[PDB]
Design a protein around this ligand. Structure first.
Ligand SMILES: NC(=O)C1=CN([C@@H]2O[C@H](COP(=O)(O)OP(=O)(O)OC[C@H]3O[C@@H](n4cnc5c(N)ncnc54)[C@H](OP(=O)(O)O)[C@@H]3O)[C@@H](O)[C@H]2O)C=CC1
Ligand SMILES: NC(=O)C1=CN([C@@H]2O[C@H](COP(=O)(O)OP(=O)(O)OC[C@H]3O[C@@H](n4cnc5c(N)ncnc54)[C@H](OP(=O)(O)O)[C@@H]3O)[C@@H](O)[C@H]2O)C=CC1
Ligand SMILES: CN1C(=O)/C(=C\c2ccc(=O)[nH]c2)NC1=S
Lengths: 386, 390
């Protein structure tokens, strides 16, 4: 009577998102889906309690089971250490996981037809994917950067700058071909999965050789694994330059992968091998909202990013398992969310995008529990019907 | 009769901006201001003709007279060489001038109330300083990339491994920065904050590049304490280093009204600020507007935006005034800046602004004036505004 989801690593979070997260599982996921769930408590007091072990433990779990969905979690500073009496200034969980998993991060804003987009439109969303020794130079003299190949066949030495002025500062950066390659695979697969064109954008004219190598190693992997599958879906890859991008793009239908309100932005880390994926929101814990919540005040916090974390995650578990039932479900919910907002029912943040904050009458939007309630109602219906 | 302006270095540019600059002069400056005008014609023909000499001179002039106003100039490339049979693909004027005067470039966007902004929280303006010359090359296969510092005083050289490539090849690059260059950045930066009475913010990835951005933060504080804290507190402003992630946070959540030191185009104003805090060069941040200019050539109606260009004149003129204690000029410059904003805030604008409000597809002709009409309306409100302050 319920769907078999399968293996999902979930990660609990902090403050206001910890609440929405629970609200989602309760009203939107568990009433409908059975999962073999590898839950990991990543909330600040638990991370401290276990010496950030829970984090490493979770990351390994995702590596194992391919699918991870993550609630937003407190990264620590002074005030935090002071607040929870933390033993240490724990390294961002995103950082720790990203480190054990690799891959490249894709960021997509969810588009609602009644919600202002920067460009008037933009019917379909653009999907953005983003991609050293430094020292002091006491006084004058040459800083040269020099390359000797393994076989000692040559030696190239380029001068970085000659200091006759005084001292300064200097640095050296590198980048292996492998990493560029992983960036490419991920970039093309992303374009495949979402059946959309891919673009690349570089300096290329300034940092010629560096950004050149990117142009190249993309082309090559395209022309030897992807030129084929791509046109098998009437969909291209192409290069371009940053300002010529923003050119034909800020006058575009939108809806392509481009390689280089917060409640609506969705990040996803897509690993090299295409099989492993972690989804989360792009926003934080929404502390301001949670302080209010604590104070007994009413809140209007956008659960969409967090929802899409779930769906995109579930979507990818379905894909892997070859699970048409589940696949349908994830999609069905992604629909209901956009549907419900387009229907006019929405949280305060969205309402502000439409009317501007000074203009928002309480009856223009719904509070956190009201909006979550409404999606619950609309999901229940939409599923009952089709 | 007219206000005595003083020494001002004028540079004339190309294409649409050339047409507009002549209108700004004719209609808005000259009628009210006499000026000891060192003009230099930075047209492309003339730059060609004189063997980019006129450029150099203009820079040298600005050096000597402290105040410049630049019209947008063509930067050549292959296509341009053909169009103009150029003797040579001459370097970017700004490039030439900036490498003679030094200092720090500063963009401020001009904000009208009726113009959908980037963030509606930004009710007051945000001014951004930016600091290029990095050597980069391709590792074809395995080997070591090392970066070596040999002191000029004969002390043992110092070698850092940048990466030892075993599995494959890749890319590499050195980057550098002189103390002088950073000192300059800091000064220019504190100069401009005091100038504009707004507070100053430096951002870095200092945590991540301990030594490289470490130097900046330091050099900035060390300069800030040694000679600006006094003047800063004695004006209710402050300096402060921050990290980029904190810095965009506070920015996106702010009221605007601050200068930030960082390591629509007809409303963007570029200002080169020399460290001495005595020389300034003003210019619109946009280019020569060929697209519009070729429309103008073929007899068609244009609606190009003069504000950017006008503010070149006004910061230049304003700085001149401030230098010379010219209370009369000072007023005028402001008076004109306001009239600008005002006129647009009154509905009278160019097509590009009209499309900021009504959406590019929904822009009807009656929403906006064309270049020449709008330029007149500026002329009209200026006269009127000026007549009122008397
Ligand atoms: N683990 C993770 O993935 C991340 C964690 N964080 C953590 O978040 C904590 C504090 O977050 P902070 O950086 O202050 O800001 P957040 O990114 O948490 O959100 C700050 C502001 O953005 C708006 N906002 C963001 N998300 C939503 C939403 N879903 N619905 C409605 N409004 C939203 C609200 O604006 P308004 O005030 O106008 O209502 C909110 O006050 C920090 O401790 C940080 O470490 C941050 C980012 C990612
Ligand atoms: N000397 C200088 O400081 C600079 C010079 N240039 C030079 O300009 C030439 C061509 O410039 P280009 O690349 O077209 O860049 P431009 O800055 O001239 O502008 C390109 C587009 O931006 C919009 N735009 C810019 N300024 C205005 C304005 N004042 N009013 C209305 N719309 C505006 C127009 O778009 P739309 O067509 O949609 O109206 C315009 O076609 C080159 O040779 C280049 O080197 C460029 C930048 C700076
Ligand atoms: C405005 N502008 C430039 O500055 C430019 C190139 C440049 C500038 C300074 C320098 O030191 N080297 C190169 N081209 C255009 S247009």
């Amino acid at each position: 009577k319920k769907i078999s989801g399968g293996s999902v690593v979930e990660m609990q979070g902090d403050e206001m998102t910890r609440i929405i997260w629970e609200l989602i599982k309760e009203k939107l996921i568990f009433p409908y889906v059975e999962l073999d769930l590898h839950s990991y408590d990543l909330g600040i007091e638990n991370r401290d309690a276990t010496n950030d072990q829970v984090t490493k433990d979770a990351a390994e779990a995702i590596k194992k089971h391919n699918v991870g969905v993550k609630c937003a979690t407190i990264t620590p500073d002074e005030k935090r250490v002071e607040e929870f009496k933390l033993k240490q200034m724990w390294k961002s969980p995103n950082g720790t996981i990203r480190n054990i998993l690799g891959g490249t991060v894709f960021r997509e804003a969810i588009i609602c037809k009644n919600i202002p987009r920067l460009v008037s439109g933009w019917v379909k969303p653009i999907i953005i994917g983003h991609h050293a020794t430094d020292f002091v130079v006491p006084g004058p003299g040459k800083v040269e950067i020099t390359y000797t190949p393994s076989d000692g066949t040559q030696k190239v030495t380029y001068l970085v700058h000659n200091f006759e002025e005084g001292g300064g500062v200097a640095m050296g950066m590198y980048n292996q071909d492998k990493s560029i390659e992983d960036f490419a695979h991920s970039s093309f697969q992303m374009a495949l999965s979402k059946g959309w064109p891919l673009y690349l954008s570089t300096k290329n004219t300034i940092l010629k050789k560096y950004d050149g190598r990117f142009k190249d190693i993309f082309q090559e992997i395209y022309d030897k694994q992807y030129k084929s599958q791509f046109e098998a879906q009437k969909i291209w890859y192409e290069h371009r330059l940053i300002d010529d991008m923003v050119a034909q793009a800020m006058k575009s239908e939108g809806g392509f992968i481009w390689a280089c309100s917060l409640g609506m932005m969705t990040s996803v880390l897509v690993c090299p091998d295409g099989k492993t994926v972690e989804a989360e929101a792009a926003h934080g814990t929404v502390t301001r909202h949670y302080r209010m919540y604590q104070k007994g005040q009413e809140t209007s916090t956008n659960p969409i990013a967090s929802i899409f974390a779930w769906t995109r995650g579930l979507a990818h578990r379905a894909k892997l398992d070859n699970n048409k039932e589940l696949a349908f479900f994830a999609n069905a919910l992604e629909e209901v969310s956009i549907e419900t907002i387009e229907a006019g029912f929405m949280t305060k943040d969205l309402a502000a995008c439409i009317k501007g904050l000074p203009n928002v009458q309480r009856s223009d939007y719904l509070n956190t529990f009201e909006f979550m309630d409404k999606l619950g109602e609309n999901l229940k219906i939409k599923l009952a019907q089709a």
